[PDB]
Amino acid sequence: FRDDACRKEIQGFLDCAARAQEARKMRSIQETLGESGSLLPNKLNKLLQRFPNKPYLS
Amino acid sequence: NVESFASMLRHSPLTQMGPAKDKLVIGRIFHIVENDLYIDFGGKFHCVCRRPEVDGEKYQKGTRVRLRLLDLELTSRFLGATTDTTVLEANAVLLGIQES
Prior knowledge:
- The structure is cut from a larger assembly and holds chains A (58 residues) and B (100 residues).
- Chain A has helices at 7-33, 41-48.
- Chain A is an all-alpha fold and 58 residues long.
- Chain A is rod-shaped and about 80 Å long.
- By secondary structure, chain B is mostly beta strands.
- Helices cover 11% and strands 39% of the residues of chain B.
- Chain B is built from 2 helices and 7 strands.
- Chain B has a 5-stranded antiparallel β-sheet with strand order 3-2-1-4-7, with no helix packed on it. Chain B has a two-stranded antiparallel sheet with strand order 5-6.
- The longest helix of chain B has 6 residues, at 5-10.
- In chain B, 17% of the residues are buried.
- Chains A and B meet through loops of A and loops of B.
- The PDB classes it as ribosome.
- The entry lists the keywords ribosomal small subunit, initiation complex, initiation factor 3, mitochondria, ribosome.
- The entry is titled "Structure of human mitochondrial 28S ribosome in complex with mitochondrial IF3".
- Chain A: Coiled-coil-helix-coiled-coil-helix domain-containing protein 1.
């Protein structure tokens, strides 16, 4: 448990933590704001309420 | 000797056209919302085709294009419904500008 001979290993564990930290921040905001592939439930339920299913007669 | 309605319907282009599936028709752009183009082609409903990337500028209101119709009215019935669900529009593919 000496930090003078394992310096190279610590940098790998440190630099990685920094990269992972940014990815978590970017993913959270971007997925909701970014429009890729499928829509979100909140945006898809505004579309299903414009064409509701009618199991009754009118 | 007044023409009846049954004679109009028999000799109408739509009637004689037959099934719209893979039919080449000529449309007229009457409304443009951003890239989307709203096109009438002598039917009950319009079709909404997206502006072609190659020559977007040429597609202004009035431009007459070529379409390949698939449906004249998009309808379907889904689980539990008592009637068909319609989006009030036709399905067609834009094949460019009618170059008279």
